[PDB]
Amino acid sequence: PHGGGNHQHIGHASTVRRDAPPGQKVGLIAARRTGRL
Amino acid sequence: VNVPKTKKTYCKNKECKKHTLHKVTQYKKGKDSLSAQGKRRYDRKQSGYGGQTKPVFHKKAKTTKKIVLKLQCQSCKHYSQRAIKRCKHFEIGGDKKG
Amino acid sequence: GRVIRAQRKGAGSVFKSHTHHRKGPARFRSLDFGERNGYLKGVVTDVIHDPG
RNA sequence: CCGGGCGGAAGACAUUGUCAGGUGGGGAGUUUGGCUGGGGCGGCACAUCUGUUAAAAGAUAACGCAGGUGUCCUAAGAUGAGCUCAACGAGAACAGAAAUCUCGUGUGGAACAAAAGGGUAAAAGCUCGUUUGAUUCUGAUUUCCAGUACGAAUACGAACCGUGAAAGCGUGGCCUAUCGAUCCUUUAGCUUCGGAGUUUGAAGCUAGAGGUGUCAGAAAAGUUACCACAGGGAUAACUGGCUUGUGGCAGCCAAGCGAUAGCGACGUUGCUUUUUGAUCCUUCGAUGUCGGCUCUUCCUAUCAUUGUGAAGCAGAAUUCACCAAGUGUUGGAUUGUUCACCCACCAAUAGGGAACGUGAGCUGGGUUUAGACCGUCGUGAGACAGGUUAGUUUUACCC
RNA sequence: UCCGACUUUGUGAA
RNA sequence: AUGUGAUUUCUGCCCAGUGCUCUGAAUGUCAAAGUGAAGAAAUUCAACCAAGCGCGGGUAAACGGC
RNA sequence: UAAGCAGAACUGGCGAUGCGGGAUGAACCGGAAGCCGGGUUACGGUGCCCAACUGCGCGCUAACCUAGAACCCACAAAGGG
RNA sequence: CGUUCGUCUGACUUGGGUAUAGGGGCGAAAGACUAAUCGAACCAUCUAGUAGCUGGUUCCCUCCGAAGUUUCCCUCAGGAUAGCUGGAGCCCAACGAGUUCUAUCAGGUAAAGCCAAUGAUUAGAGGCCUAUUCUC
RNA sequence: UUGAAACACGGACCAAGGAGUCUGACAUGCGUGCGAGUCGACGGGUUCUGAAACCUGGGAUGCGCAAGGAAGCUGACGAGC
Ligand SMILES: [K+]
Ligand SMILES: [K+]
Ligand SMILES: [K+]
Ligand SMILES: [K+]
Ligand SMILES: [K+]
Ligand SMILES: [K+]
Ligand SMILES: [K+]
Ligand SMILES: [K+]
Ligand SMILES: [K+]
Ligand SMILES: [K+]
Ligand SMILES: [K+]
Ligand SMILES: [K+]
Ligand SMILES: [K+]
Ligand SMILES: [K+]
Ligand SMILES: [K+]
Ligand SMILES: [K+]
Ligand SMILES: [K+]
Ligand SMILES: [K+]
Ligand SMILES: [K+]
Ligand SMILES: [K+]
Ligand SMILES: [K+]
Ligand SMILES: [K+]
Ligand SMILES: [K+]
Ligand SMILES: [Mg+2]
Ligand SMILES: [Mg+2]
Ligand SMILES: [Mg+2]
Ligand SMILES: [Mg+2]
Ligand SMILES: [Mg+2]
Ligand SMILES: [Mg+2]
Ligand SMILES: [Mg+2]
Ligand SMILES: [Mg+2]
Ligand SMILES: [Mg+2]
Ligand SMILES: [Mg+2]
Ligand SMILES: [Mg+2]
Ligand SMILES: [Mg+2]
Ligand SMILES: [Mg+2]
Ligand SMILES: [Mg+2]
Ligand SMILES: [Mg+2]
Ligand SMILES: [Mg+2]
Ligand SMILES: [Mg+2]
Ligand SMILES: [Mg+2]
Ligand SMILES: [Mg+2]
Ligand SMILES: [Mg+2]
Ligand SMILES: [Mg+2]
Ligand SMILES: [Mg+2]
Ligand SMILES: [Mg+2]
Ligand SMILES: [Mg+2]
Ligand SMILES: [Mg+2]
Ligand SMILES: [Mg+2]
Ligand SMILES: [Mg+2]
Ligand SMILES: [Mg+2]
Ligand SMILES: [Mg+2]
Ligand SMILES: [Mg+2]
Ligand SMILES: [Mg+2]
Ligand SMILES: [Mg+2]
Ligand SMILES: [Mg+2]
Ligand SMILES: [Mg+2]
Ligand SMILES: [Mg+2]
Ligand SMILES: [Mg+2]
Ligand SMILES: [Mg+2]
Ligand SMILES: [Mg+2]
Ligand SMILES: [Mg+2]
Ligand SMILES: [Mg+2]
Ligand SMILES: [Mg+2]
Ligand SMILES: [Mg+2]
Ligand SMILES: [Mg+2]
Ligand SMILES: [Mg+2]
Ligand SMILES: [Mg+2]
Ligand SMILES: [Mg+2]
Ligand SMILES: [Mg+2]
Ligand SMILES: [Mg+2]
Ligand SMILES: [Mg+2]
Ligand SMILES: [Mg+2]
Ligand SMILES: [Mg+2]
Ligand SMILES: [Mg+2]
Ligand SMILES: [Mg+2]
Ligand SMILES: [Mg+2]
Ligand SMILES: [Mg+2]
Ligand SMILES: [Mg+2]
Ligand SMILES: [Mg+2]
Ligand SMILES: [Mg+2]
Ligand SMILES: [Mg+2]
Ligand SMILES: [Zn+2]
Numbered sequence: 001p002h003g004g005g006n007h008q009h010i011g012h013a014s015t016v017r018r019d020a021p022p023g024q025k026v027g028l029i030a031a032r033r034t035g036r037l
Numbered sequence: 038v039n040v041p042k043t044k045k046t047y048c049k050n051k052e053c054k055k056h057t058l059h060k061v062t063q064y065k066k067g068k069d070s071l072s073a074q075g076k077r078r079y080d081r082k083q084s085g086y087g088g089q090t091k092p093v094f095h096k097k098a099k100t101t102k103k104i105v106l107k108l109q110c111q112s113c114k115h116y117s118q119r120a121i122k123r124c125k126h127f128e129i130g131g132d133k134k135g
Numbered sequence: 136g137r138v139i140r141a142q143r144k145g146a147g148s149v150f151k152s153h154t155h156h157r158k159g160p161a162r163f164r165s166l167d168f169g170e171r172n173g174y175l176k177g178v179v180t181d182v183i184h185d186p187g
Numbered sequence: 188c189c190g191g192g193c194g195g196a197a198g199a200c201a202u203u204g205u206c207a208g209g210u211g212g213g214g215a216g217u218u219u220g221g222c223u224g225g226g227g228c229g230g231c232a233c234a235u236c237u238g239u240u241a242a243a244a245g246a247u248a249a250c251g252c253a254g255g256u257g258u259c260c261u262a263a264g265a266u267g268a269g270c271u272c273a274a275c276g277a278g279a280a281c282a283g284a285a286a287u288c289u290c291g292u293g294u295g296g297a298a299c300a301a302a303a304g305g306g307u308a309a310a311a312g313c314u315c316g317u318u319u320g321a322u323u324c325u326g327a328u329u330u331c332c333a334g335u336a337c338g339a340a341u342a343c344g345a346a347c348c349g350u351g352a353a354a355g356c357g358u359g360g361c362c363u364a365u366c367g368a369u370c371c372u373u374u375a376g377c378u379u380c381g382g383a384g385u386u387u388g389a390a391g392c393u394a395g396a397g398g399u400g401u402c403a404g405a406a407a408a409g410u411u412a413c414c415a416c417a418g419g420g421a422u423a424a425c426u427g428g429c430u431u432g433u434g435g436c437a438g439c440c441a442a443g444c445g446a447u448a449g450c451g452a453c454g455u456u457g458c459u460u461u462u463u464g465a466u467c468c469u470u471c472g473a474u475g476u477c478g479g480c481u482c483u484u485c486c487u488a489u490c491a492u493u494g495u496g497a498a499g500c501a502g503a504a505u506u507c508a509c510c511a512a513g514u515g516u517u518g519g520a521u522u523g524u525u526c527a528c529c530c531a532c533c534a535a536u537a538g539g540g541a542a543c544g545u546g547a548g549c550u551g552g553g554u555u556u557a558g559a560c561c562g563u564c565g566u567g568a569g570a571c572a573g574g575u576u577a578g579u580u581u582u583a584c585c586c
Numbered sequence: 587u588c589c590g591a592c593u594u595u596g597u598g599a600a
Numbered sequence: 601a602u603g604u605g606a607u608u609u610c611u612g613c614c615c616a617g618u619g620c621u622c623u624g625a626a627u628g629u630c631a632a633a634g635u636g637a638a639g640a641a642a643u644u645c646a647a648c649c650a651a652g653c654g655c656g657g658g659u660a661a662a663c664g665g666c
Numbered sequence: 667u668a669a670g671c672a673g674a675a676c677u678g679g680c681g682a683u684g685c686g687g688g689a690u691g692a693a694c695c696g697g698a699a700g701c702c703g704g705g706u707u708a709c710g711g712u713g714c715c716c717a718a719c720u721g722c723g724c725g726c727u728a729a730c731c732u733a734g735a736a737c738c739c740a741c742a743a744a745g746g747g
Numbered sequence: 748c749g750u751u752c753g754u755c756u757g758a759c760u761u762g763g764g765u766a767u768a769g770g771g772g773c774g775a776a777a778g779a780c781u782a783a784u785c786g787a788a789c790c791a792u793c794u795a796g797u798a799g800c801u802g803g804u805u806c807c808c809u810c811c812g813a814a815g816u817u818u819c820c821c822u823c824a825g826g827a828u829a830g831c832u833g834g835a836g837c838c839c840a841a842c843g844a845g846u847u848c849u850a851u852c853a854g855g856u857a858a859a860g861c862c863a864a865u866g867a868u869u870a871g872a873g874g875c876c877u878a879u880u881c882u883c
Numbered sequence: 884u885u886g887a888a889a890c891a892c893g894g895a896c897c898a899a900g901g902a903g904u905c906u907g908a909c910a911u912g913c914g915u916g917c918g919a920g921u922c923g924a925c926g927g928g929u930u931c932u933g934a935a936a937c938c939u940g941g942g943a944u945g946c947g948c949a950a951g952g953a954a955g956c957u958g959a960c961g962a963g964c
Contacts, residue, residue: 021587
């Protein structure tokens with residue numbers, strides 16, 4: 001899902017639903033928060 | 038467009054084939070019956086696998102409709118149907134001008 | 136598309152764990168009457184390395 | 188010793204099976220208009236009206252010119268009666284350029300929902316009175332035209348009405364645009380459900396509405412530089428051909444400058460095809476697309492050199508012009524360049540053509556495949572005519 | 587894949 | 601399961617958007633089954649109504665903006 | 667601006683068509699056609715190429731610019747002597 | 748293939764055995780590799796797949812002989828439709844005609860006009876008006 | 884193809900092979916039989932050359948002889964110019 005583009009970039013949020021199908025569930029799975037506190 | 042509510046017009050009913058007084062109301066499409074054959078045929082066709090089986094019209098172009106006036110004879114109590122030209126605003130028995 | 140790498144690990148083909156030089160499962164002795172009611176003495180004979 | 192519970196944990200919850208609702212580019216299938224001085228972007232010339240092009244019957248094209256349409260109106264529809272509009276002249280306290288009244292003139296110079304063109308004066312305009320004919324039933328004809336449909340219109344017939352004393356007029360709007368099939372749904376006014384009935388439901392017949400604006404009417408988003416096929420020279424990107432606006436070069440006049448030494452405004456006539464456009468005739472079962480290196484010929488619109496004429500030519504130098512293409516026109520810094528711009532030498536460092544000469548002669552720095560960065564753009568895949576770096580140059584023995 | 591109904595699914599107390 | 605890419609040094613502001621997430625309000629929407637009321641019945645009507653959606657909060661070393 | 671450009675009206679033509687002339691050429695001029703003999707013409711020509719006069723007659727031109735020389739047609743201007 | 752070049756005690760080189768198979772594998776990631784085949788291998792079959800598109804389409808003479816235009820169509824390199832053409836006839840012989848003449852209707856193009864309406868437009872003259880005036 | 888000798892494609896040569904066919908449904912035309920009828924097509928009988936041929940089944944098999952109407956249902960009273 002992160003592949004492609006003319007620059008290396010995800011292009012959509014890397015946080016993904018808990019119920020996403022396999023193959024779609026990549027990145028940060030069911031994250032309550034992101035970033036460094 | 039403004040139309041009165043007590044038009045005198047020809048009634049074709051066999052009781053009085055002449056000019057009688059009519060009440061004027063606006064026609065509205067009746068409630069769709071779930072038992073209509075085309076509806077029963079459509080529901081049988083939609084069941085199962087295959088997705089949408091009939092064309093679903095999208096490209097609307099008209100911004101008006103032909104208003105249909107129901108005319109009720111005050112002797113027979115039978116009805117007549119009459120469509121008028123396309124109008125954006127319509128009312129029956131509004132306030133007269135002047 | 137094609138099957139992603141995260142999906143291919145569940146088939147366990149080349150993603151099975153490397154266990155050829157492991158010394159066996161590490162776990163307590165099976166619970167029995169002596170342990171349930173008293174004590175049993177064992178002696179430590181080796182302290183060994185387990186790969187992985 | 189006795190208990191016919193292997194020992195725990197959870198427990199009618201979870202789990203299984205079947206239905207129902209949500210989510211679901213993880214995956215499947217499909218689509219992703221047309222016209223078009225290539226295509227795309229733009230526009231709409233796709234239904235549709237007026238004037239003109241249009242060549243005094245009709246018909247008539249272009250992405251021709253100037254505009255318009257998807258509405259609006261119970262009156263702005265019908266009819267009867269009465270009246271006359273724009274504007275001007277002269278008048279009357281407040282009151283003047285425009286407030287209200289009066290007389291005279293007034294062929295429409297006004298108004299008639301709208302664009303434009305027609306048309307209309309005891310009206311088709313304005314004011315008032317009564318009204319709903321903007322009604323029912325089908326036929327016929329006109330315009331479009333295949334002489335099919337639709338829309339729109341006209342002339343009758345058979346009713347029922349309105350208004351007028353009446354003849355008459357009225358089947359919407361003074362005329363020319365103002366709109367929509369089959370299937371399905373819904374509505375308005377007897378037939379069937381086939382063993383017979385009662386009786387809900389359903390299906391029919393006649394006539395409207397719900398809509399297709401790509402308007403004789405599929406239900407529909409992108410990208411490909413990883414790409415494929417069938418074909419196009421019906422169709423772009425080299426060359427060549429026509430043209431010469433633009434580019435370049437040359438003239439005529441003579442107001443001025445300093446009239447015609449040398450120049451020359453305002454005008455005006457040409458030539459050329461080393462510019463760029465315009466076109467799309469040739470080539471898409473392929474004519475190897477930039478530049479330079481090398482090599483030969485050709486032109487003259489002559490830069491130098493030969494011989495001359497002119498000067499606001501004392502000399503020296505320079506400028507203008509003529510006959511003249513015989514001989515020359517170079518070495519370098521930056522840049523892939525072409526073009527450019529500087530250094531230097533020189534008599535001088537003129538301009539061009541030959542498929543923008545020349546890749547089975549080379550080279551491959553640039554353009555322009557596939558890898559990969561950046562900036563901007565895009566949700567994305569990807570794009571960029573922006574920059575950057577790496578990227579196979581085949582064959583001659585035939586005439 | 588989540589979610590509800592039925593089925594698996596029984597027994598007794600307030 | 602992802603992003604960045606040794607060390608040094610530092611990583612500002614932004615939770616409106618799109619995502620992700622929450623133990624939060626509860627009724628705004630809201631399926632099948634089940635419930636009730638009419639009807640001779642087919643059927644119709646009505647209330648109830650799961651998750652999700654909506655409402656509210658968190659989150660940028662999430663996508664991203666400045 | 668123009669174009670061997672792009673688009674209309676009437677008619678003809680080429681496309682679908684040979685044959686004679688325009689040296690050559692889809693369309694221009696003549697003319698349309700079975701296989702032949704004889705006669706005569708169209709357009710166009712009569713110095714040679716090339717069949718047919720170096721025919722009869724009047725002027726104009728002299729090009730030391732390649733003088734000039736056949737509709738379409740294969741160009742030339744303003745201005746000068 | 749030659750010369751030149753990178754690495755060489757490690758994320759090193761290599762044999763055999765074994766595992767993973769096509770919308771699948773495997774990938775220190777180039778859409779790379781998967782038997783000279785990869786942006787979805789190869790084999791047989793469905794299958795003589797479809798094609799408005801390109802190419803070809805075989806004897807002679809004789810007679811007749813076109814169209815590139817109308818309308819509609821997701822129509823624009825295609826169809827149907829009318830027109831143009833052939834064949835088959837059949838019915839008959841006064842009827843006609845891409846022509847003139849006689850008569851009679853209709854037209855707003857060329858030209859002209861502005862010293863006529865609408866519009867544009869130069870100049871004076873005599874008292875805003877009047878009579879002229881150049882040019883559309 | 885508007886236009887080909889084309890610097891537009893195919894073609895080195897020769898031999899053999901090589902492309903509007905068969906079937907179904909309609910239609911016009913023509914030919915043959917019968918004619919308000921016609922068809923013997925599936926079966927049966929028979930057949931000493933026979934997968935021919937010959938005979939036979941229709942008082943209702945198919946098309947015709949009668950429309951119109953959604954249907955319920957009705958159904959041509961006999962022409963002049
Ligand atoms: K990406
Ligand atoms: K279905
Ligand atoms: K897959
Ligand atoms: K349970
Ligand atoms: K589902
Ligand atoms: K999906
Ligand atoms: K259409
Ligand atoms: K020029
Ligand atoms: K080509
Ligand atoms: K390299
Ligand atoms: K990150
Ligand atoms: K935000
Ligand atoms: K947010
Ligand atoms: K190394
Ligand atoms: K080595
Ligand atoms: K090994
Ligand atoms: K495959
Ligand atoms: K086509
Ligand atoms: K005139
Ligand atoms: K005038
Ligand atoms: K050839
Ligand atoms: K019969
Ligand atoms: K009927
Ligand atoms: Mg993906
Ligand atoms: Mg289902
Ligand atoms: Mg479901
Ligand atoms: Mg898909
Ligand atoms: Mg197109
Ligand atoms: Mg273009
Ligand atoms: Mg466009
Ligand atoms: Mg006219
Ligand atoms: Mg005419
Ligand atoms: Mg006319
Ligand atoms: Mg008008
Ligand atoms: Mg009318
Ligand atoms: Mg009356
Ligand atoms: Mg009126
Ligand atoms: Mg009228
Ligand atoms: Mg309808
Ligand atoms: Mg159409
Ligand atoms: Mg061409
Ligand atoms: Mg110029
Ligand atoms: Mg000048
Ligand atoms: Mg070629
Ligand atoms: Mg060549
Ligand atoms: Mg070649
Ligand atoms: Mg010279
Ligand atoms: Mg020279
Ligand atoms: Mg050149
Ligand atoms: Mg070249
Ligand atoms: Mg080469
Ligand atoms: Mg080269
Ligand atoms: Mg060469
Ligand atoms: Mg290169
Ligand atoms: Mg590249
Ligand atoms: Mg972005
Ligand atoms: Mg490079
Ligand atoms: Mg890391
Ligand atoms: Mg927030
Ligand atoms: Mg809820
Ligand atoms: Mg429910
Ligand atoms: Mg042809
Ligand atoms: Mg030809
Ligand atoms: Mg002869
Ligand atoms: Mg002589
Ligand atoms: Mg010639
Ligand atoms: Mg002269
Ligand atoms: Mg080597
Ligand atoms: Mg697998
Ligand atoms: Mg590897
Ligand atoms: Mg790539
Ligand atoms: Mg195969
Ligand atoms: Mg269509
Ligand atoms: Mg073709
Ligand atoms: Mg006129
Ligand atoms: Mg004129
Ligand atoms: Mg061509
Ligand atoms: Mg040929
Ligand atoms: Mg050629
Ligand atoms: Mg070809
Ligand atoms: Mg060949
Ligand atoms: Mg043969
Ligand atoms: Zn009545």
